[PDB]
């Protein structure tokens, strides 16, 4: 009845050492494979060293199908660093069909079931790198018009049907920047990113994804509208129907270092900067939280009961972690079913390995 949709990451199958080999396929019902790049208007190969070559993640992937034929791998064109071939691609019918048709070459000689746009993001926001106009607002419901034929077109022929899925922003930015209205209509489903709201951009602590507004966090150019109930309502009164609404969920946390503890224990106070890491400073997989921090080594949980959001503080370091509570997660999943959504999304299964939030959602949901 849910969707449960997992993003793999492709650099999983370095020092992380999580192949799709790893992923347990009776907990998810679609996995997005992070990411496939974009070069001269072309969805292309993003790492030939673990996707078609070397560790060989797709070969894996299509194992994985044969083992469990209602399973759905989508391929992830973009993310964060690589939507800078978006703007380019969406802007004239021409560079519309030759995406699209590299898109549908790229899903049939790989064995994936589907397209995610992962746009980061139309008109406005994203990395140094990142391209824009302002048709942009136009042109990425054409691109998803496109694809949505091209798909339908190759599925007919193929006996198949391909999906086509979107990444969309948190900030309500995105809404007032795309047809949402419009482009709904051409989705499988829609993956809110229901997370990245506070992160180590800024220099004072905050909930990656609270739950409900905390008007008592109220730090420069923070809006009142950056939680998952705000975004979901923006997203549904956009236009996005409630069945086709997919939750995202983070499964890593931010830290930063030497925050002033107020009368918060560290909650929405000035800080020094990044605190640890896993992978590098500042992220932490909740694998690692769960191990070593979670009410352990001068890390303390709270509990925040406007936003329904749990933080560590180390009084000592002072560093403050945001994370993806099971008290929280049942809290979303609750709404989830309450308001009639597509189910959850999370980034990234990776980051789970005792998979203590990833069971909770399938536990919940399927
Ligand atoms: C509320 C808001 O708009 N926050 C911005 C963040 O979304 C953004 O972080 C980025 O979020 C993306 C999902 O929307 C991720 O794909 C991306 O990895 C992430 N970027 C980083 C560096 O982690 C940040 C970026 O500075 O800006 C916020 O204002």
Redesign the pocket.
């Known amino acids: 009845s849910y969707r449960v949709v997992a993003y793999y990451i492709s650099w999983g199958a370095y020092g992380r050492s999580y192949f799709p080999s790893d992923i347990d396929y009776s907990k998810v019902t679609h996995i997005n494979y992070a990411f496939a790049n974009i070069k001269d208007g072309e969805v292309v190969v993003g790492d030939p060293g673990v996707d078609d070559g070397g560790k060989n993640n797709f070969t894996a992937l299509r194992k994985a199908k044969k083992a469990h034929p209602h399973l759905r791998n989508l391929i992830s064109v973009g ?2 660093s690589w939507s800078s071939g978006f703007s380019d691609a969406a802007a004239t019918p021409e560079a519309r069909k030759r995406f699209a048709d590299s898109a549908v070459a790229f899903i049939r000689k790989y064995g994936f079931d589907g397209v995610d746009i ?1 746009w ?2 139309p008109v406005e ?1 994203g ?1 140094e790198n990142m391209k824009h106009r302002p048709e942009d607002k136009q042109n990425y419901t054409l691109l998803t018009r496109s694809l949505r034929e091209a798909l339908d077109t190759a599925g007919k022929a193929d006996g198949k049907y391909y999906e086509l899925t979107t ?1 969309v ?3 309500d ?1 995105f809404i007032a920047n795309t047809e949402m209205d419009k482009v709904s209509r051409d989705f499988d489903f829609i993956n809110v ?1 229901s ?5 180590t ?1 800024n220099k004072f602590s905050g909930h990656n994804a609270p739950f409900v507004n905390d008007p008592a966090y109220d730090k420069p150019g923070i ?1 009142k509208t ?1 939680n998952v109930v705000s975004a979901v309502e923006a997203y549904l009164k956009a236009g996005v129907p409630a069945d086709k609404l997919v939750v995202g969920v983070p499964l890593y946390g931010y830290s930063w270092k030497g925050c002033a503890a107020g009368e918060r224990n560290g909650e929405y106070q000035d800080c020094n900067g990044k605190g640890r890491g896993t992978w590098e400073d500042g992220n932490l997989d909740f694998t690692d939280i769960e191990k070593n921090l979670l009410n352990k080594k001068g890390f303390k949980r709270y509990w925040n009961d406007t936003a329904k959001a749990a933080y560590l503080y180390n009084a000592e370091t002072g560093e403050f972690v945001t994370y993806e509570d099971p008290q929280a997660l049942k809290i979303k999943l609750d709404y989830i079913k309450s308001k009639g959504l597509g189910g959850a999304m999370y ?1 990234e299964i990776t980051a789970d390995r005792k998979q203590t939030l990833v069971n909770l959602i399938a536990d919940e949901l399927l």
Request: charged fraction near 15%.
């Open positions: 993310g964060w992962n980061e993001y926001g990395a990444a922003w948190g900030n930015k990113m997370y990245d709201f506070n992160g951009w809006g950056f980034w």
